[PDB]
Point group: D2
Chain length 222, copies 4
Amino acid sequence: HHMSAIKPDMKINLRMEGNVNGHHFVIDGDGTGKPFEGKQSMDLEVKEGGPLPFAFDILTTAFNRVFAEYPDHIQDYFKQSFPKGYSWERSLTFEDGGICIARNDITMEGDTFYNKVRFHGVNFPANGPVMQKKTLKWEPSTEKMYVRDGVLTGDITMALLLEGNAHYRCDSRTTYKAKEKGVKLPGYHLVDHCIEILSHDKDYNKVKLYEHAVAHSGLPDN
Amino acid sequence: HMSAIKPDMKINLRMEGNVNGHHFVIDGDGTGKPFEGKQSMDLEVKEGGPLPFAFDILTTAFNRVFAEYPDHIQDYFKQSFPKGYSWERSLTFEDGGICIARNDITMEGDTFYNKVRFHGVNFPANGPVMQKKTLKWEPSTEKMYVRDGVLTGDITMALLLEGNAHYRCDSRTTYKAKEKGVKLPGYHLVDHCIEILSHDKDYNKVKLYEHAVAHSGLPDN
Amino acid sequence: MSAIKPDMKINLRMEGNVNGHHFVIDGDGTGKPFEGKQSMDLEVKEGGPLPFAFDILTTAFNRVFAEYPDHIQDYFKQSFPKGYSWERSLTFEDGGICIARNDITMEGDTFYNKVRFHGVNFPANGPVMQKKTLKWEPSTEKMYVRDGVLTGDITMALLLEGNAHYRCDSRTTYKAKEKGVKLPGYHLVDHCIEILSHDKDYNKVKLYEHAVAHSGLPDN
Amino acid sequence: HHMSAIKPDMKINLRMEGNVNGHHFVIDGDGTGKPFEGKQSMDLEVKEGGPLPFAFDILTTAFNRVFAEYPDHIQDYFKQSFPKGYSWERSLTFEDGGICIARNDITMEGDTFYNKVRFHGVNFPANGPVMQKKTLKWEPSTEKMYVRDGVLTGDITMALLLEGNAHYRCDSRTTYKAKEKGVKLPGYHLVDHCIEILSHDKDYNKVKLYEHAVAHSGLPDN
């Protein structure tokens, strides 16, 4: 199904304000993406709070499931949420007690998605891999999409690659809510994810981010 | 140390936050007795009223200075003044609801000043929080310990619900004094009891009360 | 003619498996139920010496030994002479997870305990497999009813060498054998457990626990 | 590093003893599988404790990652652990407080894998979907494989489909340990899973189980 006001190529405008371990920051983002191919890119710039005293990687998943390749046999809740848009809320529970919450209100004007992003993280240990900037990248992940109390819900077993090829686990819970009433909820399905920083300066004040996402029903069909 | 904390202190508090996309602003003015571990506060919602969620989830964000510390336990919080301290908190409810909170506590004369932030996400629409089915926080015991050079408190909390059911919440708080060299305490326990004394129908005005006592657990209590 | 006596004996036998290592431990002790105090002499019969820290087993070695005030229902003393049983999960912060069961019966002045203990996923470099634990810190068990079953959740912490701590979350469900035992309201149970003495390999251990129920501040 | 001694067609012999909510049970298993194709089937029969008073589905993932299709660019820790074999330990954390632990000692003799399985579950609510037997199936899952404390570890975001098209979440952590020294540890990778009860009698005293598993590196390389 389609009926989408979404174009094969869309612009992305993003502004994130947040606070991690008492450090405030504001980050602007501008990029493009192909929603029906599940890919998007963005140029990020730290406007306030730079250089960040924590690992930039923890913010990257907050920098839109519209950019996910959905097959025909799986309801695309996110592309059906427009032109009105949708919003999501997220909790990030790291294995060393660090906990983050995030929210994003996504709207659309013409060919541009607008993202109002907030990010708050607490209880990160001073000598943990986040505050010591020992993270290398997010590993590829698979988000489990299901309905809980009438709201589409995604749980992810995530892992940050660390120096020395160790890993730093993080459990993600996201709730997605369309702004329009009556948007049909999808059945249980999986969404493969891979997010990557293509380039960045030394202090991570400027970052180029990329993500590729594909929805599927899992084995043994797809 | 020459006692910068007085037996009777005033409390000024200002909380800004967002729970389930709903922004709110709450002002607070109250008094307390730090050496007796008791405090009261009059809360008034300035923005976002009436709140569409249970007011009880905010109450523990509305200062461990107001905790009776015995002589045999280091009082990290009373030693953090006049400069003050700050804490960060995470609240993990059993139905997926997760809250984070911060508070920057300063002191000017006989008044504590509190800059509080509160953010909650993923609360189910039919859960006891969004349906406002909570009655009170049950009495709790905070477990104080040092982790990575930071005093940490873990609490097994439970909200009493309508229908005499309970609603579990796990709390972890990290306390950090602003002055360098403040002596960290050993392992100890802090009993807590928080209670809404009165409120209007929409909880736009709330009178809150807390009593806290630190101890070493059995059999030293 | 109460089934609970002021001074009662305790007979216990634990069989278990931690990280693939099987063990059998016998226990014999005494206790004062109304004072909430008990002691026990433990002896490893199989699997000795234990390759893991003995402290993780100690809470598996009976809430009858808890001083209950009048204003709090004593579910555990009401469960006898027939007895009760509990199941327990121990979730340690480094991924180690333990489950435990205990079927408690009574004959005369003696409680009988059929205890099982199973643990998995303890890291080889963790404080349990390195035996770096010193003691359990004093804890407070949160008692409440969930789906008609009395449940206790505890924020526990093991003191380690170097004055560090090692966190463990405990949930216990208590079920009386007899139907119609009155369920208590919400209350707290302070705990303090201690190994009084032990030989070098912990093949013989003297264990002690004191427990007191209360309603928290400001009523207790 | 060495020859796996694994054949394209293997027999499977399994014996599980366990205890869930105070109920003891013994279940025997006999089936076949194709290790290089990542597929296996098994006929289960309850020898003791029948009929089971709990949902049979909670036991099915305890009924061997040898039966997983591994590409050449990913180290196959499990096929390389034979002929000597390996063992795994697992914890199952359900969202309503029910917690299970499980272990399996896997050896090999000729064309037959031997499995010594143990399973213990506690704190399942009496009115929960497990004790009321309201589960339908495991949804397709993706196991995240990584090295933790020198041990290959798999974390999975699992979900049981319930009657009423609701879902019942479960977090799984498995540690895999080869019996032989010198087995090369793999890098981070994903293992898609799909497990299904093909047939069963009314009391689940006899159950036909099937699993298909494929290892991969995630998007966009796999």
